[PDB]
Amino acid sequence: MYTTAQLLAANEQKFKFDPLFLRLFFRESYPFTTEKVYLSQIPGLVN
Amino acid sequence: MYTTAQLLAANEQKFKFDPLFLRLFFRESYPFTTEKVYLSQIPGLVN
């Protein structure tokens, strides 16, 4: 019982994580108000 | 009796002792007030 025994460390050492994909290619964000979403792409290929 | 001794310079002879460890990693010091010491570390692993 005579073992008060304070500590002096709270080491987390938890992760090695940095996305860089929400920062290098996905810089622009667009909020929604509609349930459905369209994303079209017109191709160019002539005779 | 008749000696007539003259003393010249002396030597030093100290160690080649430099910590490099009480100065690089152990920079922070604490005293005690308890007997035992804990060292806790939380395993940070989210799901």
Swiss-Prot record, chains A, B:
Homomultimer. Interacts with FI protein. It is found in: Virion; Host cytoplasm. Assembles to form an icosahedral capsid with a T=7 symmetry. The icosahedral capsid is about 60 nm in diameter and composed of 415 major capsid proteins. The assembly is primed by the interaction between capsid assembly protease and portal dodecamer, and major capsid proteins assemble cooperatively to form the procapsid with the help of capsid scaffolding protein. Major capsid protein forms hexons and pentons of the icosahedron. Viral genomic DNA is packaged into the procapsid through the portal vertex. This is Major capsid protein. Belongs to the lambda phage major capsid protein family. The chain holds residues 3 to 49 of 341 of the full protein. It comes from the Viruses.
